[model samples]
Target: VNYQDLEDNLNLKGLISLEDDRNANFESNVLKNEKFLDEAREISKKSIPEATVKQMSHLPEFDDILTEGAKKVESRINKAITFRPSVEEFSEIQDLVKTLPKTKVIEDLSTKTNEITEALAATSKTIQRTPELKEQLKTAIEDFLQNSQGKPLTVQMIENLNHGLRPDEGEGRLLYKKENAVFSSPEAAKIQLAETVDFINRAKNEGIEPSVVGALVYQRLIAYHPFAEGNGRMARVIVNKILLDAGYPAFTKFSDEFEPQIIPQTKASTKSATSSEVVVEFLKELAKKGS
Candidate 1:
């Protein structure tokens, strides 16, 4: 089913901001043109129609299997995010895990994420002067995920992670030059992480209509680019972990599907682009299977 209308609606604020530049009168004029508006509206309507309802409705049967399979995935992610298994232990267990239904295509990805998480945890620890780097990464991620179980994700926690220090007095603030790429500077990273955490908390605390927290977190994590080397992989893993923790189905982003659906989209952006569309598609598919 076409979802372009939803995409447009979600992106309307950004689009409007783009058209708001006083220096670009022509751009504003184009955006305000009545004829252009009508054409755009027509295209949007055509691109997203009632077909979405039908397609989404037909998705539940497959989703059940996905939900069941996700349980296993959640178990593994929980362990990885807590214990920080060695690369060998991570790879071995992941290799033995069952693939999701209709997605034997993703076994390699399951193995890869497992290994990457292990290695990244190790790297993150080494940078932080922690012993058993892998274990620290796992403990930190697991703690973050678990702590947010009943409560909303907090800005303080995110800030702490971004800087790899405590929220008060810069205990975990970014110390490396490369880590600054995502945050731009240590201070900037703290601010971004705080903003993201605040946004998610508000969504949870207020009645914001139960949007896709997994997808939202996924997008925000990528935008924050909190880590240096493994941000992309870690972000995806965290998203999957979020979904699993939320009692939703787990998904494996196959290298084949990922290259086309995600990699190109990420690469096309100068800064991190909004991945609402891609995430929506991903969730819709997951919903179908679970339903």
Candidate 2:
């Protein structure tokens, strides 16, 4: 069995292979060995016998191999289900954003600010963003705008958000899973995060609409799943900051009404539908402010 080909197939199905050389060779060796193949083929029709499985566990070598294989498959399944974004996807999302209706910039900053803070707090009372944290988030966005000076969003900025949003959780740590989605591995998250920052900044420079880019940033943060918690609230706050930076109003609300449909769309295998829905919502709200 060509494990590399298997790995490619798994990835195409939105699964990740634990691509280390040792693991690669180990799996290949097991598959290529006639003894293991013969037994596995026999067991394929009727599941491995419980007695055989228990007896194999008594042998340290078999136990070790079984344990390792089990762990690998578990990790692969987790990775396969996780929301892994790509640079190409962002490009596609950017084009999708371009097709959206123009957002009407609301005029009242103070009112908009108050509405946003309130909305962030209301987004999920179950996994609450406290009043203090919400206020701090609003301030952080302001500070970023005042200080950024064309600098791309940084890993440190995201880490700082962890402090505000989840002070008890380890700040700056890349975490593994979320409710409906598993996140990128720490290494992959870091690499893609840097790319995400570049993508946002590049879009900003190219004169893409802020609310459109805002929705992109929002979806990226939620999909990045970088922190142990508080991702949704943090994304809302950050998106508003992106809006504010471009002289637009802070988004008035992030209604939970759409969350049920949106969460599934954030999966790695899903197309750019989530991005489109978000930008559409932002524009819809802005249009309401007009009426």
Candidate 3:
């Protein structure tokens, strides 16, 4: 969020420029070269250490699974963002309740969408906590995914996974008094999760553009800050999920490229800061290169 300070401290401008050059060169010389795939095959024998390849082979089938999962994630994210709840102020409530447990179904269906905006606000703030918070996050994501009924993973889901997987710093447990409970209220968190799920379902039913939907979902998830830790890492995962779901190649947001776009606008509360412009540009560039 501290754009100027980040730039000064990390020398981001120079590094990003260098990365841009390298990517360009890769596109022109490697990606587009007719012999690139064949060369890659030959190079793999010598350049990739056999031990490393063997190790990678033994690793769980994460690569293939993740690749397929990415497409699902992307689809779900796109659907979530462009979702327009149709039922009054309660819009997507019915759709959400149908998938959730029967206990809170009626209560949630009756509540206005805007009533939970505060929880949504808190959702973003919670993600700044330390890495030790991963387990809680993982549970949240897994639960959300399970409830989705094969829907693509949303940004919130991705964030939860990232938090669960990463190490959190020693930010002690979140405070939860009777009146001012933070993320301690499981009900509140579930509402937020349901809302996210509902949004995605509506978006899919409406048939929005996949690329735009992907960008919007990616931006909102990053902006919402749902986890108590690992927000950025989760966001990266979410972005890849969107792309992979859409049958596109997976892409990683190197810290070098990520900081420049996000850090600068961290403190700003305006919508412009959270808009999908920069990310869309990056994805467009990637698509062009792949083509």
Candidate 4:
């Protein structure tokens, strides 16, 4: 599914929204493959030449990449459901910074025993999904973003979120099932996730632009709310990860990462019972801005 075909389908059907070389799900042309991550790494290599990618590491607006990247994620997550630290709630974050005193990034998000902390913890858990690959998440995601190799990381992503954040939810499942959403049923959360994973794989393999692919992934995951409390946060984190891997410039990779739906309506244009529509146009705008 190249961007042309993806955009064509969206014009016809509307919004839409990852994994492996080893795999599950058959909802679409991009769904289910054991070779998904290999395909992701392959896509990354071909999409950006070193001359272009090299600039990302040294751009004058590097913080914009991180800050703007972080903001889009926070904004998108909050849009799907309130997940950002409020100017009020962000107070705790400031408090943590004072005590720690030497923090390096806004990514120091999950410090308190609240939503922000759990979300941060959940995102970081992706790295710890495999102890051997703790610091290698970027590399692991590059290498194993596709199959069974990727599933363990995804499962832990939600698991850590629920277990680490909502202690009140002890012993419960990551997702219990939703209904009357933008998609069909909550029971299908994981199904959509698998299909989303597959879609990413197919796009990577077929040579679709990475930003379009990342947008789809972000839109689908948030629409599902598949995990307990951190669905919005989890999806945002991974989507950015995918964008970077896809060889996008950090400066323009975010901002348009989410949707205009800040109020949470039940019906959506994407596969999520509550997903998105017309996302391709968003990506088109981004390409022109960053380049």
What TM-score would each prediction reach against the true structure? 0.40, 0.52, 0.36, 0.39
**lDDT (10s digit) by residue, model 1, range 1-291:** 222233232232332232233214422333334443444333333445557634644666533332333233222222211212233432332332222222334333334334334534432435346545444455555555555556666655443343432222234433322322122222233344454465445544543322244455555455445454445445554565545443344554423444243321224343222244444444554555434
> Of models 1 and 3, which has the larger lDDT?
1
State the lDDT of candidate 4 residue by residue for 44-119, as single tens digits.
Answer: 4454676765677577764243333223332343244212223332233223222221223333112211222222
Candidate 1 stretches greater than 4 Å from native: 1-137, 159-189, 207-211, 233-242, 251-274, 284-291
Comparing 1 with 4 on TM-score, the higher-scoring candidate is: 1
Model 4 Cα displacement at 271 (Å)? 17
Clash counts for all predictions: 15, 0, 19, 24
Better of 2 and 3 by TM-score: 2
**Higher-TM-score candidate among 2 and 4?**
2
Report the lDDT tens digits of candidate 2 across residue range 1-291: 122332121121121122232234534543344544443334332456757766765676763454343234324433332333354443444454444443456535454456456656666563354655556656654444444545777767765654565534554544433222434433334444555566566666556566656655665566556555666766776676676666554564545565433433336554333444554565556445434
Give the range of the ten consecutive residues with the poorest summed lDDT in model 2. Answer: 9-18
Alpha-carbon RMSD, each predicted model:
20.7, 11.9, 21.9, 21.5
Runs in model 2 deviating more than 4 A are: 1-116, 126-139, 168-182, 252-254, 263-274, 289-291
Candidate 1 shows a clash count of 15
Question: Which stretches of candidate 3 lie above 4 Å from their native place?
Answer: 1-149, 152-163, 167-196, 254-276, 288-291
* Better structure of 2 and 4 per lDDT: 2
